[PDB]
């Protein structure tokens, strides 16, 4: 489906490409196969991201990466890519709003769930390769709000920083107040506890 | 990782150095040599600098800003505008012109910063190149007053004549390819 859409959206195929024209245009790779080149990259990138956030043609797992310095757009539909959900930031305002958490709060008898949040475009799944192209905010309220200017172009925001830890390290209370090797040792000891 | 900046040198210490000494490895990971100066050279920093220059390997590639291989049929023609003056001066009383002049020219520009840092001399470099390749290379060097240090190299005039009636159609590397090989060898192994 992605290849069909790309053909619709003015992507010249490699076979039809005059060799001279490649130099000034971005190369579009899908699952590691160089499909073609696109003369105007940013419009295509925005359109692909819109499609993914509406879940129309591009599934949520599909990851689009644009390397601006190297003039390459890589789209990966491959399996085994590791992804984490992140909130989406437009302008400097989080897309998640009070109406969404009100619907989630009454998750029972409203049939509003994480899938609805993903479909609404509030959250998105981002793999590491796409993480390299994403400006993230650790905490929304602190970093998004205007201050002494550090970054005014945040594109995603972390849901909560404690989710970096795994299953065994999550049972540690006050992990940030421990030495790192001790957290590592508790992760091993917790597997051997009795219960 | 947890040595100090006081050493100001790469030093292998700890278990890897213990293994190097124990196994008596032919090639240490960081071979090093501590040189103690005899007399006034130890007292004066400038004399120590002289000794440093004597002890540190320096090649033409370190002091060469850029190299260009030109084709100039006539030395008097001076295809490069800049070298017109000194080529004319040298050919006012030309040397080795009687044998011939090789048309292919190797032009080497030497960075003044590196040249003065190692305290090398244009005449010194010319002598070293002349000794290394004998008479097969003819070198023309600018005066130090010139803003750009230029060294002009041509194939041997006798070799250009071939000094042989038969002349041998082998034509190994012609002259341009031979000049490129000469440039690579000079840059890598000049040992100025």
């Amino acid at each position: 489906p992605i290849l069909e859409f790309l053909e619709e959206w003015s992507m010249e195929n490699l076979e039809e490409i005059s060799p001279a024209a490649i130099a000034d245009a971005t190369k579009i790779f899908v699952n590691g196969c160089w499909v073609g080149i696109h003369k105007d990259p940013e419009q295509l990138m925005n359109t692909l991201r819109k499609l993914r956030r509406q879940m129309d043609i591009i599934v949520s797992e599909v990851s689009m990466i644009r390397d601006i310095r190297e003039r390459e757009i890589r789209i990966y539909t491959d399996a085994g890519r590791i992804c984490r959900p992140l909130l989406i930031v437009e302008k400097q305002k989080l897309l998640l709003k009070k109406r969404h958490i009100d619907q989630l709060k009454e998750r029972e008898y409203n049939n509003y769930s994480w899938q609805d949040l993903v479909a609404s475009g509030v959250v998105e799944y981002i793999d590491t390769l796409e993480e390299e192209t994403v400006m993230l905010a650790m905490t929304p309220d602190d970093l998004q709000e205007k201050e002494v200017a550090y970054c005014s172009t945040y594109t995603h925001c972390e849901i909560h920083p404690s989710m970096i830890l795994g299953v065994c390290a999550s049972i540690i209370p006050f992990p940030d107040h421990n030495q790192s090797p001790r957290n590592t040792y508790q992760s091993a000891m917790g597997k051997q506890a009795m219960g | 990782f947890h040595y100090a900046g006081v050493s100001a040198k790469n030093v292998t210490l700890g278990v890897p150095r213990l293994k190097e000494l124990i196994n008596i490895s032919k090639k240490p990971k960081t071979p090093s040599l501590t040189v103690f100066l005899l007399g006034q050279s130890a007292r004066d920093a400038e004399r120590a600098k002289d000794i440093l220059c004597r002890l540190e390997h320096t090649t033409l590639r370190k002091v060469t800003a850029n190299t260009a291989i030109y084709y100039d049929p006539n030395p008097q023609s001076t295809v490069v505008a800049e070298d017109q003056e000194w080529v004319n001066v040298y050919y006012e009383m030309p040397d080795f012109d009687v044998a011939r002049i090789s048309p292919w020219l190797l032009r080497v520009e030497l960075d003044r910063k590196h040249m003065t840092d190692r305290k090398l001399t244009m005449e010194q470099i010319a002598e070293k190149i002349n000794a290394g390749f004998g008479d097969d290379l003819n070198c023309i060097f600018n005066d130090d007053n010139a803003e750009k240090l230029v060294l002009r190299i041509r194939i041997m005039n006798s070799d250009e004549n071939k000094m042989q009636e038969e002349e041998e159609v082998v034509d190994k590397m012609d002259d341009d390819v031979f000049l490129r090989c000469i440039e690579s060898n000079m840059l890598t192994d000049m040992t100025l």
Binding site: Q179, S180 | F1, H2, Y3, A4, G5
Partner: peptide, 8 residues
């Protein structure tokens, strides 16, 4: 975890 000269 301390510094460059100390320990990690």
């Amino acid at each position: 975890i301390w510094g460059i000269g100390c320990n990690p």
